[PDB]
Design a protein around this motif. Sequence first.
Motif, short mmCIF file in Angstrom:
data_model
loop_
_atom_site.label_atom_id
_atom_site.label_comp_id
_atom_site.label_asym_id
_atom_site.label_seq_id
_atom_site.Cartn_x
_atom_site.Cartn_y
_atom_site.Cartn_z
N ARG A 273 1.03 -1.97 9.11
CA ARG A 273 -0.42 -2.04 8.98
C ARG A 273 -0.87 -3.20 8.09
NH1 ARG A 273 -5.33 1.13 8.72
NH2 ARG A 273 -4.39 2.58 10.23
N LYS B 218 -8.64 -3.79 10.29
CA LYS B 218 -7.25 -3.37 10.35
C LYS B 218 -6.52 -4.08 11.49
CE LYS B 218 -7.19 0.60 13.45
NZ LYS B 218 -6.16 1.61 13.85
N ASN C 81 -4.38 -4.26 6.20
CA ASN C 81 -5.74 -3.85 5.86
C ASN C 81 -6.50 -4.97 5.17
OD1 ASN C 81 -5.44 -1.31 6.93
ND2 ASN C 81 -5.56 -0.20 4.98
N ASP D 231 -3.55 4.95 1.92
CA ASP D 231 -4.36 3.75 2.14
C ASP D 231 -3.99 3.08 3.46
OD1 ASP D 231 -5.53 4.26 -0.29
OD2 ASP D 231 -4.46 2.69 -1.38
N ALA D 232 -2.71 3.10 3.79
CA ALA D 232 -2.22 2.44 4.99
C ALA D 232 -2.70 3.12 6.27
CB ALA D 232 -0.70 2.37 4.98
N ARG D 233 -3.04 4.41 6.18
CA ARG D 233 -3.44 5.16 7.37
C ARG D 233 -4.96 5.28 7.50
NH1 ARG D 233 -1.50 9.82 4.33
NH2 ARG D 233 -3.26 11.16 3.71
N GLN D 234 -5.69 4.69 6.56
CA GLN D 234 -7.15 4.69 6.59
C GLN D 234 -7.70 4.23 7.94
OE1 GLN D 234 -7.38 2.22 2.84
NE2 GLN D 234 -9.22 3.47 2.49
N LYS D 235 -8.78 4.87 8.37
CA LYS D 235 -9.48 4.44 9.58
C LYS D 235 -10.83 3.83 9.21
CE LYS D 235 -7.95 8.59 11.74
NZ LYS D 235 -8.53 9.17 10.50
N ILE D 236 -11.29 2.89 10.03
CA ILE D 236 -12.55 2.20 9.77
C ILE D 236 -13.74 3.09 10.11
CG2 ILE D 236 -13.99 0.21 10.36
CD1 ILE D 236 -11.57 -1.43 10.77
N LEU E 63 -12.91 -0.59 3.81
CA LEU E 63 -12.00 -1.11 4.82
C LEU E 63 -12.81 -1.74 5.94
CD1 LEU E 63 -9.08 -1.37 5.89
CD2 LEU E 63 -9.48 0.77 7.13
N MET F 77 0.80 -1.22 0.00
CA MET F 77 0.00 0.00 0.00
C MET F 77 0.84 1.26 0.00
SD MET F 77 -2.85 -0.91 3.02
CE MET F 77 -1.38 -1.58 4.11
N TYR G 233 -10.05 -5.48 2.88
CA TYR G 233 -11.09 -4.76 2.15
C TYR G 233 -12.16 -5.72 1.64
CZ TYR G 233 -7.50 -1.10 1.98
OH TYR G 233 -6.55 -0.17 2.31
#
Length: 137
Positions: free
Chosen positions: A68, A81, A70, A14-19, A78, A10, A72
Amino acid sequence: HPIEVVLRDMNNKDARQKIKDEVNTQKEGKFRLTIKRDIRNVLSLRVLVNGTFLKHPNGDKSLSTLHRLNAYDQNGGLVAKLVATDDLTVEDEKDGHRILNSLFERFDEGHSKPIRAAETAVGVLSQFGQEHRLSPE
């Protein structure tokens, strides 16, 4: 002393995305799992990983630092995580296997839906005895 490499599935965004919305959580040793509560109609899973790996002289790789993981759904949402609170050693292997089990059992207890993973994730899943769950086809 170690030869380290940084392997990524990633980019940083994208790697820091929160749910989104309400979630469930699980701790197993250093591993911390966050998973979307409403996971009905998740029809498939795609697993991506960023991490630092210890290179072994014979070429093998072991995850020393999970940045991280993830997961999907089919729609690019997402749904899960996985992070860790400290660097990883061989003693964390049972914690890792167990919490990844929990991840996949929540989405696929019936063991029917397709689960795929990108290059880095595959190696990680292999290390924690989870590659058998994959349907790379």
